[PDB]
């Protein structure tokens, strides 16, 4: 008697051998020269952008290639808790701060564009990252969604549970000299905690499409 069991009679397929490990996702590079207050380094529909991080030459994501996304290829409904680690690489002669927060089903609020300001990001679940210490910081994102299961493929827009933000709380500031850097590197590791897939079909029974970006 919990409400994920009230959506699907078929039991869930749980393959922890090929899920539940830290996967690398993206690395992003922010500049000294365009790092202001409220600069958006990462603004992604999550976990859609992570799971569809692998793209074709014609730019359709394929679940087949990463052993972590192997069940997303053969099911149609899925549900899982996430954790996003952010690592920035420690350069001692600079200073700056990153704020990373997650907005549950953010993209469909009427006031979405107003909630990007980093003042508003200090009110949703967030983490702070320096360049000195406080390099790594792990967020936690439990499954919270309108329906007890998310769709894995199209027919619109599967796997859009929220929006992940990474913004500049204190601008990337450097010393005035040439041995100083022009940028740094910020790497985002993901993993799934309670992965339940249901509605096991074939592959090639549903399609993916070239993914759309947030404004």
């Amino acid at each position: 008697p919990t409400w994920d069991r009230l959506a699907s009679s078929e039991v869930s397929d749980e393959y922890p051998m090929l899920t539940d490990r830290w996967l690398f996702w993206k690395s992003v590079k922010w500049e000294v020269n365009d790092s202001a207050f409220g600069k958006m380094l990462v603004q992604e529909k999550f976990p859609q952008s992570w799971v569809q991080m692998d793209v074709n030459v014609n730019n359709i994501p394929r679940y087949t290639n990463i052993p972590n996304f192997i069940p997303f290829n053969i099911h149609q409904y899925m549900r899982a808790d996430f954790e996003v680690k952010i690592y920035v690489n420690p350069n001692d002669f600079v200073s700056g701060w990153l704020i990373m927060a997650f907005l549950y089903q953010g993209s469909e609020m009427f006031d979405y564009k107003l909630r990007r300001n980093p003042a508003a990001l200090m009110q949703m679940p967030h983490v702070l990252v320096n360049v000195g210490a406080a390099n790594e910081a792990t967020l936690k994102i439990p499954y919270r969604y309108v329906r007890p299961f998310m769709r894995c493929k199209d027919i619109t827009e599967p796997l859009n549970m929220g929006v992940l933000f990474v913004e500049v709380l204190i601008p990337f500031r450097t010393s005035a000299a040439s041995s100083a850097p022009k940028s740094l590197d910020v790497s985002l590791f993901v993993k799934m905690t309670n992965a339940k897939f249901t509605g096991m079909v074939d592959g090639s029974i549903a399609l993916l499409s070239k993914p759309i970006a947030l404004p």
Partner: protein, 151 residues
Amino acid sequence: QYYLPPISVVSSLYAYTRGSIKYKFLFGNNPRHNARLLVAYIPGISSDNRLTLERARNSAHVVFSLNEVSEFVFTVPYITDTMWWPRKYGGPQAAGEFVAPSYICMFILAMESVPSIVTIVPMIAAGDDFEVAVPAQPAVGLSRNIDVIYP
């Protein structure tokens, strides 16, 4: 005028629904004929454009031998992302903008003493775990008087 099953009429009186549906097939052959049938159901596809005998052989399917009985009963369960499903002919959305929570398909895999034509009659009833939710404007009406006044 439509001869809806007992399950259809009751579900025109409610807003949501959920649970398994039983299909009972009745084959008008006689033991001389033989064939095979693959009845499968696919849980999340709403239009038949994309399915074929090798795509549908990877779902939950039973292969029916076409001679073990005349009356074969095949239960498609309830596998969805949500807990209640709206009806197709009341609200909410736009009639043919509808997505059923699964498809059922029947795939294949000539004597002169026996009738060529085998007729199949399908019967449909609600499963044992089936429920209906909120009373709503009936999608149907009695045909006592089938007259109407279009605008």
